[PDB]
Design an enzyme around this catalytic site. Structure first.
Site, mmCIF file in Angstrom:
data_model
loop_
_atom_site.group_PDB
_atom_site.id
_atom_site.type_symbol
_atom_site.label_atom_id
_atom_site.label_comp_id
_atom_site.label_asym_id
_atom_site.label_seq_id
_atom_site.Cartn_x
_atom_site.Cartn_y
_atom_site.Cartn_z
ATOM 1 N N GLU A 175 0.846 -1.188 0.000
ATOM 2 C CA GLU A 175 0.000 0.000 0.000
ATOM 3 C C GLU A 175 0.885 1.243 0.000
ATOM 4 O O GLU A 175 1.903 1.275 0.702
ATOM 5 C CB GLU A 175 -0.956 0.001 1.198
ATOM 6 C CG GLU A 175 -0.323 0.264 2.558
ATOM 7 C CD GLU A 175 -0.224 -0.986 3.414
ATOM 8 O OE1 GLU A 175 -0.259 -2.098 2.851
ATOM 9 O OE2 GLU A 175 -0.112 -0.857 4.652
ATOM 10 N N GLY B 73 -0.391 -8.564 6.504
ATOM 11 C CA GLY B 73 -0.363 -9.347 5.288
ATOM 12 C C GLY B 73 0.968 -9.262 4.574
ATOM 13 O O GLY B 73 1.674 -10.267 4.440
ATOM 14 N N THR B 74 1.315 -8.061 4.105
ATOM 15 C CA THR B 74 2.588 -7.895 3.415
ATOM 16 C C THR B 74 3.759 -8.117 4.362
ATOM 17 O O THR B 74 4.693 -8.848 4.022
ATOM 18 C CB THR B 74 2.670 -6.519 2.747
ATOM 19 O OG1 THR B 74 3.919 -6.397 2.055
ATOM 20 C CG2 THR B 74 2.545 -5.394 3.754
ATOM 21 N N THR C 256 -5.879 -6.520 16.264
ATOM 22 C CA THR C 256 -6.365 -5.551 15.297
ATOM 23 C C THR C 256 -6.738 -6.184 13.968
ATOM 24 O O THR C 256 -7.077 -5.460 13.026
ATOM 25 C CB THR C 256 -5.317 -4.455 15.064
ATOM 26 O OG1 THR C 256 -4.097 -5.051 14.609
ATOM 27 C CG2 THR C 256 -5.052 -3.694 16.350
ATOM 28 N N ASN D 268 2.854 -5.328 21.021
ATOM 29 C CA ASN D 268 2.178 -4.054 21.240
ATOM 30 C C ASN D 268 1.602 -3.962 22.647
ATOM 31 O O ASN D 268 1.662 -2.901 23.278
ATOM 32 C CB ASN D 268 1.077 -3.861 20.202
ATOM 33 C CG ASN D 268 1.613 -3.789 18.793
ATOM 34 O OD1 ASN D 268 2.254 -2.812 18.410
ATOM 35 N ND2 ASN D 268 1.353 -4.827 18.010
ATOM 36 N N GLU E 142 29.797 -11.331 17.299
ATOM 37 C CA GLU E 142 29.922 -11.786 18.681
ATOM 38 C C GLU E 142 28.583 -11.747 19.398
ATOM 39 O O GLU E 142 28.336 -12.562 20.292
ATOM 40 C CB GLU E 142 30.951 -10.946 19.437
ATOM 41 C CG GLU E 142 30.689 -9.457 19.422
ATOM 42 C CD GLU E 142 31.904 -8.652 19.844
ATOM 43 O OE1 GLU E 142 32.578 -9.057 20.815
ATOM 44 O OE2 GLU E 142 32.186 -7.618 19.206
HETATM 45 N N1 LIG Z 1 42.798 -6.492 32.211
HETATM 46 C C1 LIG Z 1 42.039 -6.102 31.117
HETATM 47 N N2 LIG Z 1 41.104 -6.963 30.715
HETATM 48 C C2 LIG Z 1 40.419 -6.441 29.611
HETATM 49 C C3 LIG Z 1 40.656 -5.212 29.001
HETATM 50 N N3 LIG Z 1 39.809 -4.987 27.930
HETATM 51 C C4 LIG Z 1 39.055 -6.097 27.901
HETATM 52 N N4 LIG Z 1 39.403 -7.001 28.913
HETATM 53 C C5 LIG Z 1 38.818 -8.315 29.204
HETATM 54 O O1 LIG Z 1 39.203 -9.179 28.194
HETATM 55 C C6 LIG Z 1 38.224 -10.179 28.035
HETATM 56 C C7 LIG Z 1 37.906 -10.339 26.520
HETATM 57 O O2 LIG Z 1 38.978 -9.899 25.855
HETATM 58 P P1 LIG Z 1 38.820 -8.946 24.388
HETATM 59 O O3 LIG Z 1 37.777 -7.972 24.869
HETATM 60 O O4 LIG Z 1 40.183 -8.321 24.300
HETATM 61 C C8 LIG Z 1 38.330 -10.014 23.218
HETATM 62 P P2 LIG Z 1 39.500 -10.472 21.780
HETATM 63 O O5 LIG Z 1 40.129 -9.184 21.367
HETATM 64 O O6 LIG Z 1 40.413 -11.486 22.422
HETATM 65 O O7 LIG Z 1 38.508 -11.043 20.743
HETATM 66 P P3 LIG Z 1 37.304 -10.378 19.775
HETATM 67 O O8 LIG Z 1 36.040 -10.681 20.578
HETATM 68 O O9 LIG Z 1 37.365 -11.117 18.450
HETATM 69 O O10 LIG Z 1 37.660 -8.921 19.676
HETATM 70 C C9 LIG Z 1 36.981 -9.728 28.847
HETATM 71 O O11 LIG Z 1 36.956 -10.381 30.082
HETATM 72 C C10 LIG Z 1 37.275 -8.238 29.107
HETATM 73 O O12 LIG Z 1 36.731 -7.752 30.288
HETATM 74 C C11 LIG Z 1 41.667 -4.294 29.443
HETATM 75 O O13 LIG Z 1 41.978 -3.219 29.020
HETATM 76 N N5 LIG Z 1 42.336 -4.863 30.564
#
Ligand SMILES: Nc1nc2c(ncn2[C@@H]2O[C@H](COP(=O)(O)CP(=O)(O)OP(=O)(O)O)[C@@H](O)[C@H]2O)c(=O)[nH]1
Ligand SMILES: Nc1nc2c(ncn2[C@@H]2O[C@H](COP(=O)(O)OP(=O)(O)OP(=O)(O)O)[C@@H](O)[C@H]2O)c(=O)[nH]1
Ligand SMILES: O=S(=O)(O)CCN1CCN(CCS(=O)(=O)O)CC1
Lengths: 427, 439, 50, 427, 431, 189
Positions: free
Chosen positions: E63, E136-137, E171, E198, E246
């Protein structure tokens, strides 16, 4: 080598302790931030008595700051020299005891005393050889009086050999500021008698009278009274920290001034107290110094010594002076007033001389006296307690935390026994 | 770190709370809309605002108040007033019909409708504060809502919390100036509950404050606004020790320990002596001695009773502003040496002194002049037993003929409650007589 | 209106807590007329007499 | 001489590496623009360990930044030290692994691994004598846990003799922020056990607990945790860059700690961590530093060291201190905790003292502990993996990229052997 | 760098797209004419080179009245004029008309436009199909379009936002038939179907927002807020970014269990937000309340399997961890025993943007709790009951079989949905 | 104090105006130097004044409900390195002013939210320059400005550099000058 642990309990105890630490830092040349800014090697030498080492010439006190109200900690931290204390030594509860001895002695005091004892033991174990403990509190309140007495009992149980000095601020009816002070005072007198080596009774009436008639202070506040008590406290232990011709530590004073174990309630004083107007009209040599020391109007216990002979006396002098003048002045003040001293003791006055006077004074003396005039100080409290307990007023507040009338009767009987012990040597 | 909960019940309670919260907002520098313009006050010792006003992340401050009323008129007036954005909308609890000056309607019939919601809001407020010190209850002592709903809420709060303090600021019926014909009935029915569940009930008479305004302020024809302002000043001076620094700070538990000697003898008086116009204040010296003396004269008490027939039992003087303890000690000595001021023989010291370094604040347009010193003299005097005797006489006069008992029994309240309340008040007067007589 | 970037998550408080020489020491003075200032002047101070 | 190649994999690895390079630049006086603004000659004599000279007083770090999503690398480029790294050293893919080990290890990761190895080889061939590799990654993610393991395998194949150091952030259940992190953790530790030579286990839970209890930080951001890990990393390799009374490089540590090839998982720490309130009131000395190193609350792994006997430990002290004090403190720690160390090793700890502390710090010590208590993390990960693999909770995502259900079985069994070996020597 | 194609089908989908694009333009500071007074808008907009920004959307609907309203509305200058696909005759709430008869008239043009949009891309992430099950659509044409998309883009993700029939509020008379027929195509090609109801949003607006009579202009705004919270990780930086890949990995355990719920936590009125401390713990706790989900079902009657919390604004990760620990301590919120770590977290730094005149209040932080739970099977059971009641007597199947469509596929879809609900019941069983 | 960045490449002058729009434009993602300078100066001011929490922060300014202006004074040192010599934050607010004789006011006036100069440059007489620059930029006289809980040092600063003394204090911890001619009284006694 003779370290001293300082405990502050209650509002009055905390404020007097803050003034005391300010005065000690003045004597030792310690910056309010903890640094050392002194100009004499003597001040830094034997500084371990009241201070610890924190590296980079920074010293922190051995003080334990204790109160059930966090507001007191906030005020202490905000006040001058508040940065000096160690934060881990601040132990506090949720709210104050509310002038209730039982609240501060059985539930809240019981819950906080574990942490307080942990801090005290941690500080004591670090000392090379502690001489003892000194504690500042007020008998009229609930927190200070009650839980400080609990601390006194616990520490005496843990350290039976160390000297325990309590600078308690006893209540007086003239300058009464609370309603249930006699109950707390009567309950604390028994503990003070039982578990203290030597206690220095201090009264607000005496301090106000001193500030009004000895000094000419206009509108004195709590700060001036706390400063007088601080000067006395510093002068008591001046021999431990500085060299002198005739040194005397706390144990020596206890030996000299305690004929019998329960007769250790002293009467402090300070010698060079004089008005600002009379600074230039009066000298400060030894004779007038001892004359003030033994003057009945220069006592901080609010009792007239003329109503009772001294058991013992002790004037701890400071500054450069000749021992001959000191000895002859003590002999004169002991012979000319023979009616004010006990006959059964040959020599009543113990003399100690130090080579370092307080800053700004050529020479100073601290007088402490084991007179029997404390009879009146405890008679006032006994009268007030008897009047209040005749009709059991305000008793439900104490019975609501675990106390009993039997404990009140026990405390009254113990304090009556103590005052009778003072009386029967008056003769 | 220390917080109290303010509960205002009934029209009188809500109207007094209006002045109380105005005073708090001016004292802590909080605008009526909720914002606090001073960013620097969010730190240091200026964190005193947490005692009354709860802080939110948006910068607004929400008072810890529960304004509950069975009728929506006064609360709607607030919601359309200046303080509409101040209080939390959920705290402003409203009904649909008032108690109609009936104790039974406020206690059971209309009480049960919203008592649960009121308790839920009070619990929600309590769970937000970590240092709950007590409760402040404002209610008309002889009203319908302020009697019945206050009784119900007080007993429910005593059940729920218990050890937490509860301080009542009631409007005791005047000996002559009574605005309703059924005041003594509600007054004596709520006497039973206010004695059992409260901790310190500071009653107030409208006629006494009318006389005080006429004399010390030269206000010929005053209204309820002045009375509410004076009560707010008293409550602010009472709670000043919980949020400001000064020598001899007095907590609520300190107040209860010092002033209340027996579990049932807990009905003090209250007076704010340094009440004076802007003109007479210039001539007055306004020192500690005269403001302390003015407390004890019968013309300054805010309950229409003469203290001369009743020996004082415990006095708590809460000073403010520039006060030095030497002046207080001198004033106490001069008061004790007076023969007219009769104390009991079993209380050698009966003065509890509380000093604060925060001078009282003055609302603009208020009758009270700016003063450097202020004091509240809360005395547990026995002379108010005369006021209870007058109330009992009024109750006996109406109950000898069963004047309006049917109104009460028609709302699920038994007739025996009248006799129970009368005998409870008689027992209270007997206890006062026993305590007052010297040993 | 535009996207908002934040700097609080980028703060490094530990880098300052690892210092051991930087000491502030100096602190501001409270208002003498304020209640805290009055308490500091009265109950935490004294008129010099010697 | 003894150059180190540093590789940052994943978001967490990139953040930790950026903070580590900021810390090192502060240590060596390297300006964020890459210039040298230091004031000590000892900071430049060993700048080649972590940096390559660019001629015009510019020292580009020898770092390789790899991440499958370009967002983190754009943030690093726009960060405080975006000009430090070599622009061509940045290697990135089109889209992230999506928390998938298979995506980041088999197809999407393997597409970029060729470029990553090319740039790693280019950086390595520029060294006079390479020491080893440093790689920072997180086991919980997909990009990190997959690409890092694949890079480790490739580098171990290419450089079988150079030391390998991995600073891995092990996932913790209490700070679990991913639904399928145990799968990646197991599939990563499978390769880590066989390939690498020293894995430093880091837990976000332990770092938060440190920032709360010790530093008393109300709001610990990721900057604080990254800074703690950076301080540990700087402490570990401080003997390769500054002179010291006793020296211990990476190979010396590897020989001293690991008794067996598979027991190369370590719990790190830091000694001078103190709060701001207690900063002034705490005297930093070798006994206090050693006590804080061996404190359980100071460990950067969630496992409590008191739950298992220590195999070997290593405290790399930094600063001017007497070797007698260090030796006596370490011997005292060993003697007091004799139940916490294996009885079949006479001396259970390795010591190293360096002369150059961290900037603004007078004395510091980095703790590296090898204890059987590290089995707790692997046991928790094994329990979670078993719970999810009993029903193949999310296995279809991994099998869609070419994985097998038999590979998951092998990884769980292989990690169980790692737990068994650690438990074997704990009695 | 990372851009997402959005498709809107039917009146419901088109109006939801209107709300979503108004919200996006406000968020990125793009005027209705398309001119912007950095890289944030690259995801949801395409640069024209001349400074204008054309949204990456296709408005397709049989429509033409609603699309005519768009073309005569304020936002007539945003979308590409050839991207507003229109027909002549609506589907008339008939699956067959939108799937075959009228569908084939414009399905080729819609596919050509989608291919044109995808070719002008470098970093395609997924699809955002907005439609309604009951229409419908929005059912037949959506089924056909997704059937062709699963062939032309078999690898890319397909995130579907579908309006669901309410348990009681209705409706249309034949919406159970259309919903049942669409449940076949949702399983085959879609990857995540965040169905919303809704009636649930009506209850949310009545209770939390306190508006008594909302008419689609608050529902569409709430759905726009939900989708903006979902996609905020792709255009605004922050800690713990959550891309679509993810997102699906953490949220979808099995190929058929891909029907998450939706929830926006800080939905409160303007005058109530000023007096409330909207902490992270508080909003996280109020996410899990049964009276806050946007699907009319009780999550307390089912077991959670995977929960995604996409926090926004000023949020500290430690607060999130504490809140999640608090949630996991509670026993009322039951999680399946085979998923011990069923929480996925995203903390974007960009706070939500409130539209002028909108019901939502200005808040510093927000979160969109996206839970995959077994409690959603109640709604499928309700539609099964309705379809069985309407098909026992064959109420309106003649209209369907008379439009080039077979009778047996009704039973086929019925048993497909029966298999789906049986699969949910089997998966919900603890190990 | 010192910041490892060349502030001359962004700030057009020694004392650079920074509005809410300006701070939004200078995002911390790509222009971290300005945000770090704001945050560190606010932290220094809070530490010097002893406040429990920092009141001056970049995030608190960008997301504030009302527009605020902050003033930064710097000095280029060498290359990518600069120093910071002060901080001043001003803004407009609605104040419930109360003058003498209990007259109630409700007027819009300038506020001094934060005013801090580093101790090393506090004796250089540069806070006066910063305040003069603020007055010139925001064309507000000292008469119609308000001070948020002014410290003592600020009191001597005012009474010495502008001959403005006897700051009448309002109930909201604001000490506005003795110039209440802004507008008519909303209420009179
Ligand atoms: N100690 C730290 N832990 C971190 C930090 N940033 C993320 N994380 C922890 O790391 C865990 C996941 O790691 P990433 O976020 O680095 C995921 P990765 O890069 O390994 O994979 P992708 O999901 O493909 O990007 C998760 O528990 C986060 O809380 C950081 O700066 N310091
Ligand atoms: N001081 C003061 N007294 C008040 C006020 N309002 C009522 N009173 C007195 O309180 C008593 C009755 O109070 P109400 O306000 O009528 O009581 P209520 O129980 O709230 O009444 P309903 O809501 O009709 O059930 C009378 O003695 C009034 O004079 C007020 O604002 N201030
Ligand atoms: O101006 S000069 O540099 O000469 C003096 C320094 N200047 C004094 C006035 N304010 C301090 C107010 S407060 O920070 O103490 O509140 C900024 C600093």
């Amino acid at each position: 080598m003779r370290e001293i642990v300082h405990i502050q309990a209650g509002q009055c105890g905390n404020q007097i302790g803050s003034k005391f630490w300010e005065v000690i830092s003045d004597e030792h040349g310690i910056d309010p931030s903890g640094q050392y800014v002194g100009d004499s090697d003597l001040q830094l030498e034997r500084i371990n008595v009241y201070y610890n080492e924190a590296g980079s010439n920074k010293y922190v006190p051995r003080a334990v700051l204790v109160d059930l109200e966090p507001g007191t900690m906030d005020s202490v931290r905000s006040g001058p020299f508040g940065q000096l204390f160690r934060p881990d030594n601040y132990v506090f509860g949720q709210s104050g005891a509310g002038n209730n001895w039982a609240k501060g002695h059985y539930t809240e005091g019981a819950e906080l005393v574990d942490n307080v004892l942990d801090v005290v033991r941690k500080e004591a174990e670090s000392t090379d050889c502690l001489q003892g403990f000194q504690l500042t509190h007020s008998l009229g309140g609930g927190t200070g009086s009650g839980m400080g007495t609990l601390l006194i009992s616990k520490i005496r149980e843990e350290y039976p050999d160390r000297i325990m000095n309590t600078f308690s601020v006893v209540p007086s009816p003239k300058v009464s500021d609370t309603v249930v002070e006699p109950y707390n005072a009567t309950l604390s007198v028994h503990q003070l008698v039982e578990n203290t080596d030597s206690t220095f009774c201090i009264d607000n009436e005496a301090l106000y009278d001193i500030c009004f008639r000895t000094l000419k202070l206009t509108t004195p506040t709590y700060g001036d009274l706390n400063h007088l008590v601080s000067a006395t406290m510093s002068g008591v232990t001046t021999c431990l920290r500085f060299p002198g011709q005739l040194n005397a530590d706390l144990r020596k004073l206890a030996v000299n001034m305690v004929p019998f174990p329960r007769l250790h309630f002293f009467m402090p004083g300070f010698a060079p107290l004089t008005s600002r107007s009379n600074q230039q009209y009066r000298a400060i040599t030894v004779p007038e110094l001892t004359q003030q020391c033994f003057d009945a109007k220069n006592m901080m216990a609010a009792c007239d010594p003329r109503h009772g002979r001294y058991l013992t006396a002790a004037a701890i002098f400071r500054g450069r002076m000749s021992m001959k003048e000191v000895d002859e002045q003590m002999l004169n003040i002991q012979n000319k007033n023979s009616s004010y001293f006990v006959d059964w003791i040959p020599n009543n006055v113990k003399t100690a001389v130090c080579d370092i006077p307080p800053r700004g004074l050529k020479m100073s003396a601290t007088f402490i006296g084991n007179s029997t005039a404390i009879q009146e100080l405890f008679k006032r409290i006994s009268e007030q307690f008897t009047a209040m307990f005749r009709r059991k007023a305000f008793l439900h507040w104490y019975t609501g935390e675990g106390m009993d009338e039997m404990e009140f009767t026990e405390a009254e009987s113990n304090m009556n026994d103590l005052v009778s012990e003072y009386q029967q040597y008056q003769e | 770190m220390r917080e109290v909960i303010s509960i205002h019940i009934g029209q009188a309670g809500v109207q007094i709370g209006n002045a109380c919260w105005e005073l708090y907002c001016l004292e802590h520098g909080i605008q009526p809309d909720g914002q606090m313009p001073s960013d620097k006050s969010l730190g240091g010792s200026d964190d005193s605002f947490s005692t009354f006003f709860s802080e939110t992340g948006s910068g607004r401050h929400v008072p810890r108040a529960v304004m509950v009323d069975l009728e929506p008129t006064v609360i709607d007036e607030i919601r359309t007033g200046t303080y509409r954005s101040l209080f939390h909308p959920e705290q402003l609890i409203t009904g649909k019909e008032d108690a109609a000056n009936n104790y039974a309607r406020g206690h059971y019939t209309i009480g049960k409708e919203i008592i649960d919601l009121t308790l839920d809001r009070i619990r929600r407020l309590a769970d937000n504060c970590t240092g709950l010190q007590g409760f402040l209850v404002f209610h008309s002592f002889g009203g319908g809502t302020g009697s019945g709903f206050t009784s119900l809420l007080m007993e429910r709060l005593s059940v729920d919390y218990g050890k937490k303090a509860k301080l009542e600021f009631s409007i005791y019926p005047a000996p002559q100036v009574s605005t309703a014909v059924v005041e003594p009935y509600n007054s004596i029915l709520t006497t039973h509950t206010t004695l059992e569940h409260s901790d310190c009930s500071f009653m107030v008479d409208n006629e006494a404050i009318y006389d005080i305004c006429r004399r010390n302020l030269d206000i010929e024809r005053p209204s309820y606004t002045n009375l509410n302002r004076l009560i707010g000043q008293i409550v602010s001076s009472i709670t000043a020790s919980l949020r400001f620094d000064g020598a001899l700070n007095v907590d609520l538990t300190e107040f209860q320990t010092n002033l209340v000697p027996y579990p049932r003898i807990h009905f003090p008086l209250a007076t704010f002596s340094p009440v004076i116009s802007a003109e007479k204040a210039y001539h007055e010296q306004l020192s500690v001695a005269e403001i302390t003396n003015m407390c004890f004269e019968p013309h300054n008490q805010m309950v229409k009773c003469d203290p001369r027939h009743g020996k004082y039992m415990a006095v708590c003087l809460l000073f403010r502003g520039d006060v030095v303890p030497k002046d207080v000690n001198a004033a106490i000595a001069t008061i004790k040496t007076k023969r007219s001021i009769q104390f009991v023989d079993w209380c050698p010291t009966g003065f509890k002194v509380g000093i604060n370094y925060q001078p009282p604040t003055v609302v603009p347009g208020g009758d009270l002049a700016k003063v450097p010193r202020a004091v509240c003299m809360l005395s547990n005097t026995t002379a108010i037993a005369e006021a209870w005797a007058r109330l009992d006489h009024k109750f006996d006069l109406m109950y000898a003929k069963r004047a309006f008992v049917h109104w009460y029994v028609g709302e699920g309240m038994e007739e025996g409650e009248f006799s129970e309340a009368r005998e409870d008040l008689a027992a209270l007067e007997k206890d006062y007589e026993e305590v007052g007589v010297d040993s | 209106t535009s996207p908002i970037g934040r700097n609080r998550p980028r703060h490094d408080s530990v880098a300052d807590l690892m210092r051991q020489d930087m000491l502030a020491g100096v602190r501001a003075e409270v208002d003498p007329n304020s209640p805290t200032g009055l308490k500091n002047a009265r109950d935490f101070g004294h008129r010099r007499i010697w």
